[PDB]
């Protein structure tokens, strides 16, 4: 087994943590537990405090030209490790007991619980100008030494680590998406009918999406072009409520449908990041420190009800459009899901053959 440890700049405080990725089931979240090693001689009468924080940060170089930086807190928790609280009475996990047995009596434990409904970890694409920090939801664990909580802390007595909250694909597959639409033009000669479908609901990263298109035209018109696109929708709540849409993959077909005819076809698309570097504000999974990451995965919510206390929410859709020469268009949208499968081993958190 492996354990991740970090030490303060002065080196008196060390924190041992078991893992850096905590899975978020819909009902409940994995607890955050670990151990801290202290030196009693240096500590005259001060105390050791541990804090977990979920924050939404957004900084702009244009704003940074002035004295501007935006940060908001969503979740804060606190605990006193050393000296041990008089009540105590807290069960310990197996890894915690093993860590304490390996170390001495100076080591002391800590535990955190996360409530169900909180946003997951998501970052936003910086762009060529931004070269400072990141934008989006972040989770941090920080341990410091202070005589009182109100007192200002210093870098010499603080240790900071970054953690993540993620979700994985459900086991049971969903139903097959489908859609149907009819349109009537100015003269009621006949309607134009369009039907579209997908192969399945759940798609993993880097796999093709196949769209089945079936058109019938009985009007006195001409269909010039067909367009298939995949679109990302992101809902953000920072001082305002807003929606944002971006197309990720596109395809343009010049197939003409004559009056009183039918047409059938199958198209294939793949969303990937190689050709989406220039687009700004794109949502991504989330980075520990400056490494490439795939496109953001879908957010799963409890279906009965929703409460808007969350930072960023991501979803995807597929759009099919018919262009009509004489006048008007026809359009149809279908929803799907894009997520990782459950891994047997914890994901690496960097480029594996790193350059």
């Amino acid at each position: 087994t492996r354990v991740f440890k970090k030490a303060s700049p002065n080196g008196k405080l060390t924190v041992y943590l078991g893992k850096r990725d905590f899975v978020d089931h819909i009902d409940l979240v994995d607890p955050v537990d670990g151990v801290v090693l202290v030196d009693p001689e240096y500590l005259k009468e001060r105390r050791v405090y541990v804090t977990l924080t979920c924050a939404f940060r957004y900084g702009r170089e244009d704003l940074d030209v002035l004295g501007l930086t935006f940060r908001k807190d969503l979740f804060v928790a606190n605990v006193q490790s050393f000296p041990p609280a008089p009540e105590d009475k807290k069960p310990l996990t197996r890894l915690q007991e093993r860590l304490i047995k390996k170390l001495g009596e100076h080591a002391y434990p800590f535990t955190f619980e996360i409530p169900p409904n909180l946003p997951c970890s998501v970052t936003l694409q910086p762009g060529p100008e931004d070269t400072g920090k990141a934008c989006g939801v972040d989770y941090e664990v920080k341990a410091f030494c202070a005589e009182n909580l109100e007192e200002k802390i210093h870098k010499r007595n603080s240790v900071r680590l970054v953690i993540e909250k993620v979700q994985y694909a459900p086991e049971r597959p969903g139903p097959q998406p489908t859609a149907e639409t009819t349109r009537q033009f100015l003269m009621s000669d006949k309607p134009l009918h369009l039907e579209a479908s997908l192969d399945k609901e759940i798609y993993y990263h880097g796999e093709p999406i196949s769209v089945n298109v079936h058109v019938t035209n009985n009007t006195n018109k001409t269909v010039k072009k067909i367009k298939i696109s995949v679109r990302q929708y992101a809902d953000i709540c920072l001082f305002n409520t807003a929606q944002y849409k971006c197309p990720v993959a596109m395809e343009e077909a010049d197939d003409t449908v004559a009056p009183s005819s039918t047409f059938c076809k199958v198209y294939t698309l793949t969303p990937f990041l190689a050709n989406n570097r220039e687009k700004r504000g794109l949502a991504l999974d989330g980075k520990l420190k400056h490494e490439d990451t795939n496109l953001a995965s879908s957010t799963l919510l409890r279906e009965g009800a929703n409460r808007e206390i969350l930072g960023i929410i991501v979803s995807y859709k597929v759009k099919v459009k018919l262009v009509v020469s004489r006048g008007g268009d026809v359009a149809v949208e279908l929803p799907f899901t894009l997520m990782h499968p459950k891994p047997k081993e914890e994901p690496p958190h960097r480029e594996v053959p790193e350059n």
Partner: antibody
Amino acid sequence: VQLVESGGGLVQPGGSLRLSCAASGFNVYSSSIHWVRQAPGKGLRWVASISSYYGYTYYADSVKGRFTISADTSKNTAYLQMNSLRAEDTAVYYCARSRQFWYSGLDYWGQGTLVTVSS
Amino acid sequence: DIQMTQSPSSLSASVGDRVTITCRASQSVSSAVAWYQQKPGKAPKLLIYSASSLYSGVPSRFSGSRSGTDFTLTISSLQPEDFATYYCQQYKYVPVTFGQGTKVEI
């Protein structure tokens, strides 16, 4: 399921040679493609690698500037173009596949081709 | 680049014995190594990744272990189908590096 390698060495004393590999059952956007060279009476080496999701290509120090790697999505093939061959470049070449999310090892290997450079 | 040293170069073993092969690296590769088996005239096959995980479908006789920067592969019971060459690879940094390879002979 299978990697088929063709374009065997034509005994080129000096010039250009193109090696191609065709894949069945693999998507290019979900995997990484690697070339591995084995000399007669020697251990394995590494030559070049490509990943299409991020659009990156890496070469070894020895073959930098004389070799090129590419892949095409339409036909699911990978190409290595070799220029300015020498006496050292006589070996058996293999094409290998990895996993993009996330790397474990070179799990499926090709049959391999023989390339000979002589005076 | 990292240089990997493998030993012993050649060994002879009878059926039913247990054999061990060791490898060392100049720097810490942080538990990311893999072991390959190549029979003469054919391409290699993956055996063990992450220095402890055993690839699906591989007989459980093979085992791998790590201590510091020393990685060891062990075969408990030898059989006629287990004579080949064995290679060790690290993949933490680019370029990846293979070892010399050791031959098992009857």
